[PDB]
Design a protein around this nucleic acid. Structure first.
Lengths: 197, 304, 113, 203
RNA sequence: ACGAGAACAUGCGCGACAUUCCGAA
């Protein structure tokens, strides 16, 4: 009937990740309670949608995956990408070595006229960190599961070759996906053959 | 009719909206939960008869490490001889622990005790995450920021509610809640909010109170009676009318997204001397399907 | 703490006339061994790290011989005996604690200047 | 059909490299010296803009030549051009780490300088941290193939930038003998897509 | 039939410019 596949895994920070959001110069988005760095699910969803739109090219498949509010063709979002929270194993590893979860990066901007360097501070998530990511795929149609999952594989490949937040053309936000499990939590659909990345 | 306690522990922050995308409410009424349950039943192609005929549920109430919180009764409370501002404490009180519920009905809760109860709630932190929309940038435009008001619960806090019905209704609700863990409740479920895990069990601590008899009845859910019951159930009542609004979340209701008809329901905690049995009203305006608004009454009897 | 107490006691000129230029060699050796330990992920100090700590101890002795201010610093701060303790226990946590003690010592010494 | 071209390789230090963070920038996780991708991208963009041509009275980077805005990106309102070149942080390579562990090098050095006044002739001393000459960094660049017909030309520009960077420094005061580096490209392959990048080269 | 649905806090940006480890025997 209706099925939901749970894709849990880890996002490993290859290079310092800055997703904007006391007084800190360009702070990163954090969990309000634990004050831990997070990767908002909206960020991942938007980045994968943009990468898949670049790849395919809105297109119908993007509407099936990330949902559409267009008049007439109201499409439900098949992908629910939850916020990626700072991993507990990464938390223990960073508590060891006396390493902070976030680093401060200092950058210059050399003017094209006066050759004067304006400094700028940003905050990033340290390269050793990992985030527990959780995604739910809704099987609204059984015939498009393979197409949806190959589109997700293409988006994940593009994301692994892209950044996730901040200015990644200047060496920020590189990430890697490790898929711990892909198991059908709702319904009878067989997701054993399915794979991402 | 067997009462089942459903406890919901939330993984990600939740966006419970009142009127805006920036609103960060910590709870939802029985209307939102029942609409989510109906959507889940339609997704799983189950029958809607048990939900629409024999399920009585309460609002989503807070719970923390120490106690479960019930809505504050709208009872006439007496203060000290000259403590006029102390009444404001009872005005700011929203939830009372079950153990301290009866004491509140008997009038043995002072203003300082009410303030202690109000500050003793440890549900969580409400925040406002600022996001952006870069879709117009690719069309020679500008980014459009917006705000989502979320609420993150403390590690041992969450939202509980009580369900009443026969065995078949209870089991169907178990399947519906199991699917709702992964569907999510609230606002941006597809954008990383509302994910939770729920446990359904028996509630002796609540069966002690639900077996209590008294002279007054307290609403545990946002309810309203039909005209015939409203004729005689409104005498000596102390209630609070809430305007239930919103858009219809459905892919087949119409072409574009439209709002549903305005509804008005009594709040949780409203005290009546006559127990009225609500119903499931229709807030649909000539749509493809009938949009349901659950306003049945889950009652808690007490002595004033 | 202990570093604050010893620096205050030796404050009047600190540690009979100690400066950062006198300590720079010991600081460089200490942070080099610290980074080598940091790169490795082991609860016990490796053999090459143990030999490097022995070399650091002999460098402590050489610097004490060279300068009187460094000598009285070493005598009052128990840094050589702490190095011996780290060698005896052979635990990475103890080495990190010793490095933190030395860093706090230097920080307080700079603070009271 | 989106294409991404992955250029991986080594930046070999030739003279002591100092990118400030006078300490140098280090990766907090490994405490090893690093080359930020912002530094590489900015130096390449500046050299390419100077070589191709600088508009007189230019004040913003968005006023560069159309090739520079096409490659390194533009942020002008309306004419928002996405950067095709993504230069990642160059991390201290593991081979260089193994080579430095032998002979017991510290991955870094302190260089002593002084400033001599013209009149008083007083030499005020100073110290700058540098990366040892033998060190090597793993550089990773992603090129976004947006327009097919402009791929080869763009790569030519990149090549020119590299030819300017090998003759220039990368960080700190390179007019005094710092930051001189060399690029050796290990591979240039189309990591994403069906594009044929066999003939492309930047050195 | 969840004040809901769609929405990347993102685009551009070199921690850089001048500096004899030098006078003295």
């Amino acid at each position: 009937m209706y099925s939901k596949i749970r894709i849990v895994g880890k996002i490993d920070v290859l290079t310092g990740l800055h997703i904007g959001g006391g007084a800190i110069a360009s702070p990163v988005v954090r969990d309000p309670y634990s004050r831990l760095p997070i990767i908002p699910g909206s960020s991942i969803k938007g980045k994968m949608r943009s990468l898949l739109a670049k790849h395919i090219g809105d297109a119908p498949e993007i509407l099936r995956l990330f949902g559409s509010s267009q008049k007439g063709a109201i499409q439900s979002s098949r992908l629910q990408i939850s916020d990626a929270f700072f991993s507990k194993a990464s938390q223990e590893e960073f508590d060891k070595k006396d390493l902070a979860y976030t680093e401060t990066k200092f950058e210059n901007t050399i003017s094209r006229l006066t050759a004067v360097a304006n400094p700028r501070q940003i905050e990033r998530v340290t390269r050793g960190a990992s985030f527990d990511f959780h995604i739910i795929y809704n099987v609204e149609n059984i015939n498009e599961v393979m197409a949806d999952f190959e589109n997700i594989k293409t988006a994940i490949h593009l994301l692994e070759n892209d950044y996730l937040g901040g200015g990644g053309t200047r060496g920020n936000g590189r990430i890697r996906f490790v898929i711990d499990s892909i198991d059908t939590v709702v319904g009878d659909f067989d997701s054993s053959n399915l794979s991402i990345k | 009719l067997v009462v089942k306690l459903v406890k919901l522990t939330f993984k990600s922050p939740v966006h419970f909206g009142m009127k805006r995308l920036s609103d960060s409410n910590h709870t939802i009424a029985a209307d939102t939960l029942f609409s989510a349950l109906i959507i889940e039943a339609l997704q799983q192609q189950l029958e809607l008869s048990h939900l629409l005929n024999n399920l009585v549920i309460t609002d989503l109430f807070p719970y923390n490490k120490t106690s479960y919180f019930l809505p504050k009764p709208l009872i006439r409370i007496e203060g000290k001889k000259g403590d006029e501002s102390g009444y404001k404490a009872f005005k700011k009180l929203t939830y009372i622990p079950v153990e301290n519920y009866s004491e509140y009905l008997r009038g043995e809760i002072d203003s300082l005790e009410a303030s202690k109860i109000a500050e003793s709630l440890n549900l969580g932190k409400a925040s406002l995450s600022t996001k952006v929309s870069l879709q117009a940038v690719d069309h020679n435009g500008e980014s459009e920021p917006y705000s989502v008001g979320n609420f993150t619960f403390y590690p041992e806090s969450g939202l509980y509610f009580l369900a009443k019905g026969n065995a078949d209704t209870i089991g169907q609700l178990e399947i519906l809640m199991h699917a709702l863990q992964y569907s999510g409740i609230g606002g941006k479920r597809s954008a990383g909010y509302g994910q939770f895990r729920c446990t359904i069990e028996d509630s002796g601590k609540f069966d002690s109170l639900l077996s209590q008899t008294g002279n007054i009845a307290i609403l545990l859910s946002s309810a309203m009676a039909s005209d015939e019951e409203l004729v005689d159930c409104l005498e000596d009542a102390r209630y609070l009318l809430k305007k239930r609004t919103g858009f219809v979340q459905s892919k087949t209701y119409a072409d574009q997204l439209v709002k549903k008809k305005d509804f008005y329901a009594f709040s949780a905690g409203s005290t009546f001397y006559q127990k009225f049995n609500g119903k499931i009203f229709d807030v649909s305006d000539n749509g493809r399907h009938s949009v349901y608004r659950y306003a049945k009454a889950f009652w808690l009897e007490g002595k004033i | 703490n202990f570093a604050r107490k010893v620096v205050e006691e030796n404050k009047r000129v600190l540690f009979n006339g100690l400066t950062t230029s006198k300590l720079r060699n010991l600081l460089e050796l200490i942070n080099h061994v610290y980074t080598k330990v940091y790169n490795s992920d082991d609860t016990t100090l490796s053999e090459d790290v143990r030999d490097e700590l022995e070399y650091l101890k002999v460098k402590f002795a050489y610097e004490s011989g060279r300068e009187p201010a460094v000598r009285t610093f070493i005598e009052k701060t128990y840094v050589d005996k702490l190095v011996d303790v780290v060698l005896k226990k052979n635990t990475k946590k103890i080495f990190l604690d010793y490095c933190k003690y030395f860093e706090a010592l230097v920080a307080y010494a700079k603070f009271y200047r």
